[PDB]
Structure formats: C-alpha cells, structure tokens
Amino acid sequence: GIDFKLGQTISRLRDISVPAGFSNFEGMRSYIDNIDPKGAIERNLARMSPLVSVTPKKLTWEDLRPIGPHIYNHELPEVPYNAFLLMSDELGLANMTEGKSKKPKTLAKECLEKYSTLRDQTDPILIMKSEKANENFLWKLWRDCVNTISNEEMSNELQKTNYAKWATGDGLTYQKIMKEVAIDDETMCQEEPKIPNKCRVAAWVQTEMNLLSTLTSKRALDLPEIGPDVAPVEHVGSERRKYFVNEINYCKASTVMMKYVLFHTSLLNESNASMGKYKVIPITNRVVNEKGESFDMLYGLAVKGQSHLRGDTDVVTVVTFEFSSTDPRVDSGKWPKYTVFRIGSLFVSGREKSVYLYCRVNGTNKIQMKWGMEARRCLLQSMQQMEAIVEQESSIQGYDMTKACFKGDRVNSPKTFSIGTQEGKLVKGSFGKALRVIFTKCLMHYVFGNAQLEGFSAESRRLLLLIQALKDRKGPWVFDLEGMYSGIEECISNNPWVIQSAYWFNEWLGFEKEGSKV
C-alpha cells in the first residue's frame, strides 16, 4: 500500500503543537481516542463566571437615540466640499454641434473660441485663496492650459513643463535615502497619522441633494441599442426600461454622472498613453436636449501631472480649474479647499451672471480612475430597486403594473412615496421623483465614497434592520446597543455624505417615533 512516514523535524513540530496538558502527540492521540466526554460543556459553563454573558436587553423606541450628536454642535467647522468636481455649481460652456465626434482638444478649442471673453481674460480677480495654494501658480497653470488648448498644434502637452513642475507641487517631494543614513540620523522620525477633522452638518449637501434630483432640459445619458425583441418578456423589459430612462435621463444627476465618467475615461487614457509629460485634459460632455439638438459642454480644464504610475495606488496629481456661477462668498465654509477667481460673465437670455473659476489641486490613482469609469453601475443600482417594486405590484395584480405605477391606470391610482419634509410636515412625490432620489443617492454613494462611507453604511444597516423589526412588532433585542452606536459614530468624521446621512437618519427616526403611536 502506502507507507507515508514522518521524519524527525516534523515529528518534533507535532510534539510541540499539542494542547496544554500533554507531553507528546502520542498522549493527545490516546486521550482523544479513548477519553469519552459526558457533558464537559455543562461543567465548564457551571464553573464559568456569571459576568460573561450576552446581557440581553429588549429594544424599544426610547432606546434608539440620535446618531452622532456632535454633528449638531455649532463649534465644529462646517463640512467642506471635497468632491472631485463641482456637481450642482457646475457651469457648462455649451456649443451646438451637428453631432460629429471630434478629439477633446479640438472640442475644447472650439468651445473656448466661442467664449473668447473668458478665453482672452488675462487679468484675474482673486476672490478667495484657500490656505496655502499660491494664486500665482494656479493662475499661471490656468493660462498655460488655455494657451495649450488654443494653440494650433495637435499636441496636448503643456508648453512650459518646467513652471508646472512647481505650480502643481510635484517638485516639492521628499528624496529617498539609503536605510543606514536614516538609522544613524536622529531627526528622521515616523510621521504622525492624519486624523480626519470632526465637522458639523452643512446646508450645501441638502441643497445639492434637492437640486440633483430635479428634471432639466438637458439629457446626457445615452446607451447602446440592443437587438430587436420578439418575446413578451423582452417586450416587458423594454417597456420598463423605457419608463426608467424617461424618468432618469433628464435629471441633473445623470448629466453629472456622465461628466464624471467621460472625464475619468479621458484621464485614464491619458495616463496610459502619456507617462512623463504634463497633459491638458478638458472636462467635456455631450448633451442632447428635448428638441434633439446636440451640444458639447466644456466644464473647465485639468492639468494631469507627471504620470509615472508604477503600480495602481500610486498617486497622480490633477489640478482642476472649473467654471461656475456661484459666488463662494455666499457660503464661505463650503469652499476652504478651492482657490477661486472671477474670470468673467455671460448672458443666458439677457440676464448677466458672473463666472468664477474654482482652482483646486487633487490626486487620483488607477483604482479611482477606473472606478470613475463605472458610474453607470449607479444607473443599474437604481434600475434594480424600481424593477423589484414594479415586479411586486405586477405580482399583486395579474396584468403588468408599470403604467399605473408611473402615470396611473383606469383601475389603479398612481403610486407615491414620502419624498421629503417642510416645516416638519412630510410631503409626498410621484414614483418618478422617488426614482430620481434613489439615483441621486447612488450617485452620491459613488462620488462621496471612501472608507468612512463604507463603514457608516455597513454599520447603520444594523440600525435600519433593528428599526424595521421594531416596526413589525417583532420585539427586537439588542445585547449591546452602545457598542453598535459607537461603531456607527466612529465613521462620522469628515465625509459630507456621511454627516448628512446621519442627519437624515435622525430625522426619519424621529418621524418613525412620532408615527409609531398608532
């Protein structure tokens, strides 16, 4: 047969890998083979201390308390706007086009040629400088971007490449030295970690959520066609997709998502192509309105730094200048990271409005660059929930329920959802409005996503499920509520979305408390 036999080193490793109370593996073998336990668990539990226990405790509405009370503290600073690109304050320089697709450089050149007043604006007017950002460096970089885009050549590399090394901060980098010098050196100490600042609720997140769930005349999301459908199931799927895309196509969140996706596509392509040069990258989008006209929208420019990406997490610096019409002085606490300039003004239909240029230095990496190319997965996340709801409704009544759910049938009334509140009075909204709210929520989970958001969502799932069980009169029990609350609250530090989600959770919990009396 087989005579697999152990040597000496392995035998001695086996000898010293035995639980306490045995001198050799043979002792363990004999003990396990012969000894017959007859309730060792009962004895151990009997002699186990009484202080060790789940300490179960029934959960009631009173035990549930607001999460992250410090967000209501007025001493802490208002959360700043840390998103990569402007979302609700975005300004898009629009030029109508027949539909022909051209390179981003030419598209940006034409867009800037249309707006020559901003293109030729060489004398800036600084409105606010964040803390450190040198206004001179940022303005010189912006002028370099404008000149590089407007130059007749077809190269997309900045014409200086030597001033930009310092304007972007690439030059100010520590230089590596061999380990022995560091050992001998005494001043070289390990850098302390950067603990995120603790902030309070802000009014800009709520306004952004309100604005980005609203219909707009500009539809940007376009998707590839699929093959003809002949079976009933695919016809039903096409109908539901038609309603869903009709609702979501014309919402500002869709345009923001498409802008993000296109910008990240361009950024990743440039990083893959250009390695050792400073690149100019327009923030471009294609937008089609109700009339069918197509426009190219230029939302600013970006300087992509020295893309020497070795691995994936290696950082690449991007200096973004973005057009906007919002005066940051109205809400100063929202823009402590942005060095803005007042670059011009324009008339939309005869009403003049100023145009500021928000300049900010940020960083990205291959993971973020790619995952910004998959923001349509937010669209699928939105689709799944509405599909589930419509399937439930059509399960209740035999005939398909989509039309009544959205527009209303001759036998059923349109379905509505509790959308928000005003003056403490909750308000209702159509199914399309709830769809847009869900889409905006998913888009914000994408844009404002980081470790803090993942932790907060995962740990607040417990609270949501507990509240759901409490609603169903299931009498949920929690063994240690304060530990769960602390775990949830340790993630409410700096992410604007996490703080606003905590505020919304507290508001909804209060409303549930008030309505639970019935």
Partner: protein, 718 residues
C-alpha cells in the same frame, strides 16, 4: 422642501429597499501593510496572554498556547477553548450523523491517493521560499521541484502527490538546503541570473513555516484595512487534503451553508426557517438571532484543528491520520512575515527612507509615532531577528474555511444546556452564522441565547455583541442575504461584473453575456435590468476595445478601419460588435455565441475572411484559455481572428520544449500526458515511429529515412 432619502423606508420595507443602501458603486478602499500585520499579531497574542508561554526548540521562537487555559472572566474575545468541550461537541455531532466522519475520511483518502502533484498548480499566489516572494502556484511548484533535485529529493517525478509531500517532509530534515536564487548582478545594468545558493536547516524551516502577508484590497464593507496571508508550497497539499476532508464532512450537514452558492443558499435559508417555525411548540416563541462573529480568525487555535482532525479520523490507517495531521502542526508553528517595514521622514530636511522589517528595532522607539511605538513595545517579545513575528495562536482568514464551519456546526449541534426549556439550531458558514431558539417565553429564548454565547466562548467561538441582534423568527440576515416573511431579498452585489472581463474580444463577450444569464437565473435579475446590463456592457466593450459603430463619426486608429469596413461589406447586420457591427444580443439569446448568431447574416466573403482556418493572431499555445476563464468559469465561444492573446531564458527554453512536445504529441494539449520517463525519450520514440510510418506509407524517401535514423542515433535512442 428638503429631500430625505431615508423617508423611502416609510413606504417600503428596509429589506426590499436594502439594495440601494450598499455603496458598491464607488471606489473600494485600497491600502504599508506592516502596521496592519503588527496589529493582527498583537491582537492574536493579546487574546491568549493567559495561556502557556514557552520557547519552540525546533525554531527558537516564543510560542503561546491558550488552549485548555483559564476560562474567560469578561466579555473580551478569548481563545481559551477547552479541548474536552470540543471533543464533546464532535462526539454529539457524530452521534447525530452516524458514520459521517468515517465516510468523509475514506472519500478524502480515496481522492488523495489518485491526486497528482500537478493539482498544486491551481489556486492563487503562493509564497516562494527560493526567492522569499509571492509567485504563481505553477512557478513556485516547479522552482521547489528543481531545488529539491539539487538536494537529492526525487518525489515529484514519481507522479502522485504522496511522494511529493513525503519529500517535502524530508526536506525539513536535510542539514542544509541548496536551491537557485535570483542574483541582480550589476554590470550600468542590473542583470538577473541564477545563483546556486545554500541555507541552513533552521532558516529553511522558518522559510517553510513562513506565511507572507499582504493588505486586503477587495473588501468594501469596512472602514479599516486588514491583513491576508499567503502560504508557501510546503503546506498547500496538506491544507488541500484537510480542506477536502472538511468539505466532505460539511456537505452532509444541514446546518452548514457551505459548499453552496447562488440560489441553493436561498432555498437553504427558506427551508431552515420553515423547519424551525414548524418545530415551534404550541404557544411558544421562535427567536432568530442575526449573528456576526468578531474577527474569529485570531481566536481559533490550530491545535484545536489538530484535535478535530485526530477525532474525525479515529478509524483510519495511521499513515492517512499522520498525513492529515501535518497541516495543523505546520500552522501552530507558523511565522508571519511582517510586511515591508515602515517609513520615516525628516520634514525640516525634506528626506524620507523606508526602514525594512529586519531593522525595526534598530531605531530607538522614541522615533516612532505613539501608535507604532506602543505596537512595537508590545511586539518586541514575539519579534524574530530576521524580521518576522512568531504567530502561533490564531489563524489567518482564508486558510481553514471548511474546518472552522465544521466547528461552528458542532457548536450549533448542542441544541441545549441543562435540559432547559429551549432548543437552538441555526446556520453557520465561514464566520457568518444565524441562530434560532424555540422556547415558551422570550425570557427563556434570551436565556438560551446566553447559553449558546457561553458555549461558543468555551469552544473559541466569539460572537459579536455589537454586530449581532435578535428578533422574532421570520426576519433575519445570513451571508448578506435578507430573509423577511418568505421573500429572500438577495442583496445586489452583481455590480463588479458588468464590463470587459479580460483576455480578449470573443472571450470577454461570452463571459459577460454568460454573467448576465447567470445573474438572471440565480439572483433574480429582471428583464429590464438584464437589458440595461447588456447596454452598459456593450458601451464599456465598445469603448475599451475601441470598436464603435461604423456609422458613428468617432475618430481612432481602429475606427478608420471599422468605418471602411462598414461600407466595404454590404450586409451590415452580420458584423460583430468588435468590428463596429450592430448588437443583436437580447434577453432570448444570451446563451448563444454572437459569431453563430450572425452566421446566417454574414456576407460569405466576410465570414470567409474572419473564419479563416489559419490565423497568425490565434496561436495553438494560446488556446489554453478557451475552455475556462479565471474562480474558474466556463464560456462558449468560436475560434476566429478575435480569439487573439495579449525568467526570460527559462521561459524561452520551456515554452519551446513544450511547443515541440505538443507538435509531436497532438493529444497533449487536449488531455494530460501520463509518464514517469523524461520528455526526451517519449519525443524520440514518437519521432521514430512517425518517420517509420512516413517511409512505409510512401510519404518519406529512403535518403530522408537514413538522415532521420542518423539523427536519432546521434541523439542516442537506437
């Protein structure tokens, strides 16, 4: 009006609207991992400080044994699992399943006796000791075999995996160990060459027991990063056999949520909850506890796994018992390589420097930050000079998943303590468990939950009091799937699959479309959702492969050629999407390759052009991936121009030898060759037979026959 998304929950159950709560649309967090590994080691040894501390004479490391230690006196995690309690649980489980341990052991032995060394080529990156790095399974396996050849170890060429494991065990006894090491010789250029290096016995043993560390990347449900461990090749076979035995045992268990995936687990959840509800007594209550074990990898002692394997194989041949008890022993004496060291910087001088692991304590601890300072102060006792941590107690997640599930089901199988008026049972799968307790009043249900908590603590299982809660039966969670009143709201995690998945055009298309079909079948993806997924995948595919519609005015290198093809071919509906052709995939035809779908619609000239029998892009050596795609997934495609494919000296030599072998043996590609002789002898015999057949068949002249025979004689096989 202020929009509040949470108000949706007022109109919809949280379970139904739970999909939108997942932030699986953003960027997953990504990571030096040395700090995380140091926290892991400190925490693992902190839960077991009250055990027995000694010195490993074999390795000279500091070992800690919490098993059979003092019982816990508080609510912190404890690794002091009593052996006799575990034996009691195993005996009860075996009684409940007559002849299950024996059958699983015998089946594992049977499947082991037929396994070959080549099976070790499966899996993920493994720790290569010859270079002390992370190398693919096949590369590390062949490197270890070649190095064994130098130290007089000839088991791998014997075929079966038993001789290879025997020679691995023997390698731990040889006074020295010779192998090939990479030498980056300076010449300026850094040329990598092979150096015949030699190491001593203790260092080689430490290398064998070492478990390389890395920082997790794909985790998205936590705000902090943890450490994953990759083992070497000296343990992969033993761990494979033990895991196979554990899977054999836990396949029969009804309480086990493994090995099952897709829709089977939903049915298991529904069946378990229905069975529990039916068994509920008249007028009693069934409470369901949604549980989530704390870490639970750092409290499972490998010695408990050794005892469990010993008890499972009580009536097996001694050789199989010893073979099965080699992974746990090599785990109880494991060593953790602590990342790549720290980084210290001088701000006033604008300098930075990485301090490698071996010299962590060469710098006074006052020069580390407070967190790192305390970490190193606590880690000093278990720090090896070479730059590794002696991590005996606890386990690294991912190594023993089936065995730990068996332990959890053993805990669940107790069903009662003190004959009290309650019965508990539930589901357990790889750190995720759910419980159900039937009693007469909620007070007794909570008493049963407390008893279960204490019993689990006695076995080393520590369930979170923060991550777990309880309610009435009919609503709970398990492995991220939410059950509520019979409607299993299978969470939506299907996002990280819609997008080009790798190897090439046809394979990516087939993989994506089969993914859509599988999601529709299992997770209940709807028609509209599937169509939207197809649309998004088409968009991503067209962008990535630079293959847009011909009529579209997009500009690019391949776009000009696609534009020319658009009008150069009359039939515009037969071209693949790879060539800018229109998409025909819909809900009904997601199981059929697109080449065959448009086959009727292709112009004869176009199909002849694309489907040429000989294609330089398609290489016989690149067909390995036609069957399976990396998890191993099967996809159906059609060979064509789009089936293309995307150390140096060894690569050339091997590749060429394998290509010549494949050319001589046309069946080697399709089926695995079997033979205990050198490749040269088989190749020479095949060539001689082919030459004789060709000469006898009139396909080869006498002069060529003489030339070939002279060549073969020169080779030395006449």
């Amino acid at each position: 009006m202020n929009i509040n998304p949470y108000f949706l929950f007022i109109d919809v159950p949280i379970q139904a609207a739970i999909s939108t709560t997942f932030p699986y649309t953003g960027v997953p967090p990504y990571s030096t991992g040395t700090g995380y590994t140091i926290d892991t080691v400190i925490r693992t040894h902190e839960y077991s400080n009250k055990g027995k501390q000694y010195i490993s004479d074999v390795t000279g490391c500091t070992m800690v044994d919490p098993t059979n230690g003092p019982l816990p006196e508080d609510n912190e995690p404890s690794a002091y699992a009593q052996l006799d309690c575990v034996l009691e649980a195993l005996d009860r489980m075996d009684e409940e399943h007559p002849g299950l341990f024996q059958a699983a052991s015998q089946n594992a032995m049977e499947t082991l006796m037929v396994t070959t060394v080549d099976k070790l080529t499966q899996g993920r990156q493994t720790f290569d000791w010859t270079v002390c790095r992370n190398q693919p399974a096949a590369t590390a396996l062949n490197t270890t075999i070649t190095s064994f050849r130098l130290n007089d170890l000839n088991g791998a060429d014997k075929g079966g995996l038993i001789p290879f494991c025997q020679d691995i065990i023997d390698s731990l006894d040889r006074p020295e160990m010779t192998f090939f090491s990479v030498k980056n010789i300076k010449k300026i250029k850094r040329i990598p060459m092979k150096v015949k290096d030699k190491i001593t016995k203790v260092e080689y043993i430490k290398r064998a027991l070492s478990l390389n560390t890395m920082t997790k990347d794909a985790e998205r449900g936590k705000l902090k990063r943890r450490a994953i461990a990759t083992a070497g090749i000296q343990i992969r076979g033993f761990v494979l056999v033990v895991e196979n035995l554990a899977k054999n045992i836990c396949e029969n268990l009804e309480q086990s949520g493994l090995p099952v995936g897709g829709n089977e687990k939903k049915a298991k959840l529904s069946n378990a909850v229905a069975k529990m509800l039916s068994n509920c007594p008249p007028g009693g209550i069934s409470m369901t506890v949604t549980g989530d074990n704390t870490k639970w990898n750092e409290c499972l002692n490998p010695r408990i796994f050794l005892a469990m394997t010993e008890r499972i194989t009580r009536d097996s041949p001694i050789w199989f018992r010893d073979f099965c008890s080699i992974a746990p022993v090599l785990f109880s004496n494991k060593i953790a390589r602590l990342g790549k060291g720290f980084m210290i910087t001088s701000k006033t001088k604008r300098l930075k420097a990485q301090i490698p692991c071996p010299d962590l304590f060469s710098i006074p601890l006052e020069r580390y930050n407070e967190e790192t300072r305390a970490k190193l102060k606590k880690l000093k006792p278990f720090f090896n000079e070479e730059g590794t941590a002696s991590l005996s107690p606890g386990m690294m997640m991912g190594m023993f998943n089936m065995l730990s599930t068996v332990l959890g089901v053993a805990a669940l199988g107790i069903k009662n303590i003190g004959n009290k008026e309650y019965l508990w049972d539930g589901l357990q799968s790889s750190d995720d468990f759910a419980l159900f307790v039937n009693a007469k009043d909620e007070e007794t249900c909570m008493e049963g939950i407390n008893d279960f908590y204490r019993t689990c603590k006695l076995l080393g299982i520590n369930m979170s009091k923060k991550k777990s809660y309880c309610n009435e039966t009919g609503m709970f969670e398990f492995t991220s799937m939410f059950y509520r009143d019979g409607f299993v709201s299978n969470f939506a995690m299907e996002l990280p699959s819609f997008g080009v998945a790798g190897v090439n055009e046809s394979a990516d298309m087939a993989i994506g479309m089969t993914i859509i079909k599988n999601n529709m079948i299992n997770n209940g993806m709807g028609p509209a959702t599937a169509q939207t997924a197809i649309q998004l995948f088409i968009a991503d595919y067209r962008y990535t492969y630079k293959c847009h519609r011909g009529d579209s005015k997009v500009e690019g290198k391949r776009m000009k050629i696609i534009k020319e093809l658009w009008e150069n071919t009359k039939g515009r509906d037969g071209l693949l999407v790879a060539d800018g052709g229109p998409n025909i995939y819909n809900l009904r035809n997601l199981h059929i390759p697109e080449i065959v779908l448009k086959y009727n619609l292709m112009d004869p000239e176009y199909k002849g052009r694309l489907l040429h029998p000989q294609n330089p892009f398609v290489g016989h050596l690149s067909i390995e991936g036609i069957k399976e795609a990396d998890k191993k997934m099967d996809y159906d495609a059609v060979s064509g121009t789009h089936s293309w494919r995307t150390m140096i000296l060894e690569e050339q030599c091997y590749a060429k030898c394998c290509n010549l072998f494949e050319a001589c043996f046309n069946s080697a590609s399709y089926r695995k060759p079997v033979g205990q002789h050198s490749m040269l002898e088989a190749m020479a015999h095949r060539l001689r037979m082919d030459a004789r057949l060709d000469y006898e068949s009139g396909r080869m002249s006498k002069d060529d026959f003489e030339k070939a025979m002279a060549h073969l004689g020169e080779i030395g096989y006449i």
